[PDB]
């Protein structure tokens, strides 16, 4: 997170850390959506162009964290993965369309003041909040600058959703309906963005009708970090809700 701030304790209790076994390292962000299911970006696990192909046994999940490098004794919970599922039409060949994946935990995790699931949007929630100009919130342990460094605790930044055409007009990559873009415009004089390390974390909004937090996006890609005229791109969770439903319904819950 570029131009963000330290989170408050317990501010994003659904925030998850995808952690590399060995070498022991921060791989990406992720989110807790039930006692046994985690949501992230497919590219955190699979990206043939860079020779990226992780497996269940390669990773660890850390939940309830605040501090980036410390092992938070008595606070954080660590789980192992039972199975990973990537969308069948995830497109790593060209634009990362459908960048989404679910992970089934080995055993359910218990909730606490620091660990609690976020909600997935319904059609109406989507309809009402996913509008240009509305702000959402991004979280993560990713880099602080495009070239710098790394933060000490979880960072947070609030960003506005951008009109599709502006999004299209900012890049040469081809945009799909399974994606949206967010950030301040150059004139705006307010900055912020996701960066390396933030990938696969949650883009969330708070409902003004029922006081709950919904995850509308997954951090997907950007061209650099925090550049002017550029924007971050996110997977559109609601448009992929069916695949989520299906998988959870067929392989437990």
């Amino acid at each position: 997170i570029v131009e963000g701030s330290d989170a408050e304790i317990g501010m994003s209790p659904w925030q998850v850390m995808l952690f590399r076994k060995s070498p022991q390292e921060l791989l990406c962000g992720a989110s807790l959506i039930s006692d046994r299911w985690v949501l992230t970006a497919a590219h955190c696990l699979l990206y043939p162009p860079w020779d990226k192909n992780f497996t269940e046994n390669d990773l660890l999940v850390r939940i309830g964290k605040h501090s980036r490098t410390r092992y938070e004794r008595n606070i954080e919970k660590i789980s192992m993965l039972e199975k990973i599922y990537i969308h069948p039409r995830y497109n790593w060949r060209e634009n990362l369309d459908r960048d989404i994946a679910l992970m089934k935990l080995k055993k359910p995790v218990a909730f606490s003041d620091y660990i609690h699931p976020v909600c997935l949007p319904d059609r109406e929630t989507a309809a009402s909040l996913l509008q240009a100009g509305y702000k959402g919130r991004v979280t993560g342990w990713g880099n602080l600058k495009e070239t710098w460094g790394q933060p000490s605790v979880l960072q947070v930044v609030n960003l506005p959703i951008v009109e599709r055409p502006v999004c299209k007009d900012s890049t040469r990559i081809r945009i799909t309906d399974n994606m949206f873009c967010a950030g301040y415009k150059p004139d705006e004089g307010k900055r912020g963005d996701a960066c390396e390390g933030d990938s696969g974390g949650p883009f969330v909004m708070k409902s003004p009708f029922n006081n709950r937090w919904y995850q509308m996006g997954i951090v997907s890609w950007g061209e650099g970090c925090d550049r002017d005229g550029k924007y971050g791109f996110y997977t559109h969770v609601f448009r992929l809700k069916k695949w989520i439903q299906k998988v959870i319904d067929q392989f437990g819950e």
Binding site: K21, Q24, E25, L26, H43, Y47, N57, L60, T69, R70, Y71, I78, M80, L96, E146, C195, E196, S199, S220, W221, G222, E223, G224, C225
Partner: peptide, 15 residues
């Protein structure tokens, strides 16, 4: 993806 020192954890967690 952007197109352009961790405390050890306890021995169990692995497997």
């Amino acid at each position: 993806x952007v197109a352009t020192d961790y405390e050890e954890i306890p021995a169990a967690y692995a497997x």
